[PDB]
């Protein structure tokens, strides 16, 4: 409807796949080459389904900060025959607050879903499903089951992936450029 949705749509159309694990179906953001991200609570194993195709996981790393606190991001390298468009230049370098964000989801349950969530706070610490978690972004939208892995964007930036909610607020794990240096 506007330049926010334009950016979100551009990311969804080229940089997302449907990931299925034994814990559910997730929006999965491809970042570069065969590297993607998913919430750690997806419990990625040796095999994952990508757009309903059996795919070997070449590597999976559940990220933690240097205090050994959960970040709720898992970086996955996929045994896929095709690379993602490189979107690492759209990743923020530092922790920050944002205006006018969009949360975009693409699953069997929620195809082509875009939500204008508005103001995004650098919330920091969250007890997420009983797990202490850092670098949490917060938006005042009542997000629901099926939205985990959803991409949070502003015009020009891919800033996080949706990892939970409490019925009134939604929470995303930050994406930082420094996670994806090679």
Curated annotation (Swiss-Prot):
UniProt-annotated catalytic positions: 41, 72, 148
Catalytic function, reaction form: Selective cleavage of Gln-|-Gly bond in the poliovirus polyprotein. In other picornavirus reactions Glu may be substituted for Gln, and Ser or Thr for Gly
Annotated localization: Host cytoplasm
Residues covered by the Peptidase C3 domain: 2-180
Assembly description: Interacts with host IFIH1/MDA5; this interaction inhibits host IFIH1.
Functional summary from the UniProt entry: Major viral protease that mediates proteolytic processing of the polyprotein. Cleaves host EIF5B, contributing to host translation shutoff. Also cleaves host PABPC1, contributing to host translation shutoff. Binds and inhibits host IFIH1/MDA5, thereby inhibiting the type-I IFN production and the establishment of the antiviral state. Cleaves host MAP3K7/TAK1, resulting in inhibition of TRAF6-triggered NF-kappa-B induction. Cleaves host TICAM1; this interaction allows the virus to disrupt host TLR3 signaling. Cleaves host IRF7, resulting in inhibition of type-I IFN production.
The name this protein goes by in its record: Protease 3C
Full-protein positions shown: 1549 to 1729 of 2188
């Amino acid at each position: 409807m506007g330049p926010g949705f334009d950016f979100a749509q551009a990311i969804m159309k080229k940089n997302t796949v449907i990931a299925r694990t034994e814990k559910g179906e997730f929006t999965m953001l491809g970042v570069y080459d065969r590297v993607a991200v998913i919430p750690t609570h997806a419990s990625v194993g040796e095999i994952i389904y990508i757009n309903d195709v059996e795919t070997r996981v070449l590597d999976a790393c559940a990220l933690r900060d240097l205090t050994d606190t959960n970040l709720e991001i898992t970086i996955v390298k996929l045994d896929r025959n095709q690379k993602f468009r490189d979107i690492r230049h759209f990743l923020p370098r530092c922790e920050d607050d944002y205006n006018d964000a969009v949360l975009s989801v693409h699953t069997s349950k929620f195809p082509n879903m875009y939500i204008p969530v508005g103001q995004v706070t650098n919330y920091g610490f969250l007890n997420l499903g009983g797990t202490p978690t850092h670098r949490i972004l917060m938006y005042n939208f009542p997000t629901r089951a099926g939205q985990c892995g959803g991409v949070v964007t502003t015009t020009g930036k891919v800033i996080g992936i949706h990892v939970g909610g409490n019925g009134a607020q939604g929470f995303a794990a930050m994406l930082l450029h420094s996670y994806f240096t090679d």
